[model samples]
Target: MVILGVGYFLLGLILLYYGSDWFVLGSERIARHFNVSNFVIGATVMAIGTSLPEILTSAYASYMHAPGISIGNAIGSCICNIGLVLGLSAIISPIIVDKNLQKNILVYLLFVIFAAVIGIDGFSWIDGVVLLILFIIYLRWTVKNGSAKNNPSVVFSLVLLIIGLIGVLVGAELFVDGAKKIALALDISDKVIGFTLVAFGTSLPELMVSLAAAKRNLGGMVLGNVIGSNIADIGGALAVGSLFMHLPAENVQMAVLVIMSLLLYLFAKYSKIGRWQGILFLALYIIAIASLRM
Candidate 1:
């Protein structure tokens, strides 16, 4: 059963990853084909689209009244993005730090911090209201600083893009479903599943995008996508989760939150994230998850 579970989980991850890749390519092609700026597409459609796995996982957990899973999934993914994916990328090659990217997202990071602190008990109606308002403000800010690129004109690109996106969305559903069943069969604890499988699973898109961007030496773009996505994963996803189910903001959850914050600060200040950092993070994360063993 454990072997079966591992197989199911890994298989789901592969499909979901490929699905997300399809969605990204298709969405990019479609956005360009329709005369959209690559930047706009990347920031808006691409960002949200890539985050679809987290969104679906969080929302489904909410619908099922499993609040911890929802909150855990988002928080875990956020940490993994900055700590694991971005950290590894930086270590592989010194990633360029862009002032523009930092300036735009620092406030978003603050919001994430605020929400994590206040949202421990869950979102009050007021909290939800505030988050929604901030979301709007974020949209306004995004528009002002957003890219201004021309749309694509290739018919084949549009077709391919649509096909890819459909494949991705379907793939995500399939994988998520499979992953859930595997977790059950293996008797994996929810904490482990969230922190390891779900977190890493949802982060596949970020890893792919960041690696490709890094290889092209587009450090600014790569970091920009990562930071913004982190904000969304934290602020948006958690806020949504709290609205649906109140997360206890328990000691363990709070500890995870603090660890993520400290790591982010260290990474930013040092400006050196690579294999050593990646190994450290992976080891720490593994330990963190293992400690939850029942």
Candidate 2:
């Protein structure tokens, strides 16, 4: 059973890595076709595509009545995306930020605070509705500011996008189930697993996307993808997660997430995140994860 579980987990990681690669490539093609910037595509199209795994996992957890897994996975993935994903990317190559990216970073901060407040009393249908509404506003804002256009049909681009989405969905399922099985076998608590392993597993897509973008020297797109994934995780993923389960948002975990968001904003606001900032973010994640296990 352990062997099978490990196999599934490995396969899932592979799928997520390549899936994000294909998604980013397709989105880039579409962006070029529409005369949109890479940053715009990263923030909107690629962000949504990579975030599909978290959203789906959270929704499934809610359905299974595992509120801990649902809420924890959403918030945990958000923190991991910013700290681990963005941090590692910066470590490899320092990220350069722009005015627009900074603005979106602020918006993401607002969403994090909002999510923390709503989930304070435990997630509810009303909270879901509010989150969904904000999601719409976010979409509108991205569209308006991004100056997006759909000039012509890019068949290959659409195909890649579709394929990438399917891959991420499947990979998420396999990864979550495998990780849960392993955690149970190791006698780990569900809450601990949710906030650590499950969160890290689901965030594989974002990590791949941001790392790939950074390797290509697309710093703006990397920032956009990180910020955008956090927004979607807090707003869309949590909304969907809580829609079916009124989960207690762990105060400590939520506070950690909020702190990570603020730190990310401050780092990006002042200057590019270099190796030292990257190391700091990585250290923070380790501490947060260790605290949760304890």
Per-prediction TM-score: 0.71, 0.85
TM-score of structure candidate 2? 0.85
**The best candidate in terms of TM-score:** 2
What candidate 1 gets wrong by more than 4 Å, as runs, is 1-43, 148-167, 178-200, 250-255, 258-284, 290-294
Clashes of each: 7, 0
Q: What digit string (tens of lDDT, one per residue) describes model 2 on residues 1-294?
A: 567789888788777777766776777787877787777777787788778878887899888998778777787887788778888988888876777778877887888788888778888968987987888788678767777555446988987877876666577668877877777777764665455665676787778778777777777777778877777887788889878878775778888889988988888788778789899999998887677631
Q: Write the per-residue lDDT of candidate 1 for residues 63-146, one digit (tens) a residue.
A: 688877777777777666666666666655565344454445555566666766677666654665576567657755764665
Residue pairs with backbone overlap in model 1: 26-161, 32-152, 35-151, 35-152, 36-151, 91-273, 91-274
TM-score of 1: 0.71
lDDT for every model?
0.59, 0.78
